[PDB]
Amino acid sequence: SGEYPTVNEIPVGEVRLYQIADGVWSHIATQSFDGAVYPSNGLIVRDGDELLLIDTAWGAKNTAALLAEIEKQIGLPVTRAVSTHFHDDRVGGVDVLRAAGVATYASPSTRRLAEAEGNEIPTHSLEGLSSSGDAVRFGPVELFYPGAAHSTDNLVVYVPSANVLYGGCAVHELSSTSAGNVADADLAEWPTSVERIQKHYPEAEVVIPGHGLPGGLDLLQHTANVVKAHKN
Ligand SMILES: COc1cc(-c2c(C(=O)O)[nH]c3c([C@H](C)N4C[C@]5(C[C@@H](CN)C5)OC4=O)cccc23)ccn1
Ligand SMILES: [Zn+2]
């Protein structure tokens, strides 16, 4: 009923959308992994009379449910999707998208990592993102590679029309004391990568983490703090 939807409020398999700003929504779904249930976010950005999707809903059936929820709530076609790193919460569902006519994109680094690890593989390579600080335009967003953080390939997404910063899994929510799933992370470089984000997007109004509640710019400093303390 209007609050940001939370893990115990979303059964696995259902998807909810949340309006962030004009022409910007997040998508929220839940999935089981290693015997625990987690929420995860993605983004939807209006691209004229089409939609740009950022990240899958973490699995094939969740991603099919995402497409149905978009058709119900928004009713514009998803034409392109970008995955912001190689993990299943970002690419699991790419096969569903591709069979639904959506053109799927990721950096070459993400594509290689997904292929190596047996995750679903976006079709199209996003060049111009291989050096930290790189940025490219993609429809109504800017894609930015901040450096290694949660993963070596993680991208962030900025919506300039709305000053919305989608940090993906490189950014954690304010209630997190913990740095989430660090299996593929670079804890040493992560604060430097966050500082690059902070420098590049000083006018961000909304910051969306890969998992959990959106907030403001404080999510960035909080993330750096939690990562440093984890390493400590
Ligand atoms: C309190 O626990 C958490 C956990 C997370 C969390 C995050 C995140 O932090 O982005 N990602 C998760 C994943 C994803 C799919 N995978 C799995 C994997 C690849 C490795 C293979 N050996 C392990 O690594 C990774 O990230 C699964 C389960 C939970 C999370 C967020 C917040 N709180
Ligand atoms: Zn991840």
Ligand SMILES: [Zn+2]
């Ligand atoms: Zn994640």
